[PDB]
Amino acid sequence: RKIPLRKSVVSNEVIDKRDLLRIVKNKEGQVFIDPTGKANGRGAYIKLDNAEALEAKKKKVFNRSFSMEVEESFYDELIAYVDHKVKRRELGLE
Q: For residues 58 and 10, is the Cβ–Cβ distance under 8 A?
């Protein structure tokens, strides 16, 4: 499929296809995780990696990307989301 590999806003590294995670900001100022990659709004990518989710919060990386103060609850949601997905992947559940 020659799927384009995107760059992480956290590490500035190329992200493996299996590891791609999209975060979207809409025009209404809402920020959410977009697991299918099909949402409209402005996208920012990270690796599905606990270190990157933590660094995203430490550096408030999406505030910068999206020109807004993203809620701490969103950063905590992303940490929990990534933690759960990484655990499932390590156990071979997905």
A: no
Q: How many CA atoms lie within 13 A of 24 on its CB side?
A: 13
Distance, in Å, from the CA atom of 85 to the CA atom of 62, rounded to the nearest integer, reads: 20
Method for structure elucidation: X-ray
d(CA 67, CA 56): 15
Task: Write down the CATH superfamily of domain 1-94.
Answer: YlxR-like (3.30.1230.10)
Task: Provide the resolution (angstroms).
Answer: 1.4
In the block, residue with structure tokens 């606990």:
50
Name 14's bridge partners.
7
55 token code pair: 């660094």
Q: 75: Cβ–Cβ under 8 A, 6 or more apart, which residues?
A: 56, 57, 60
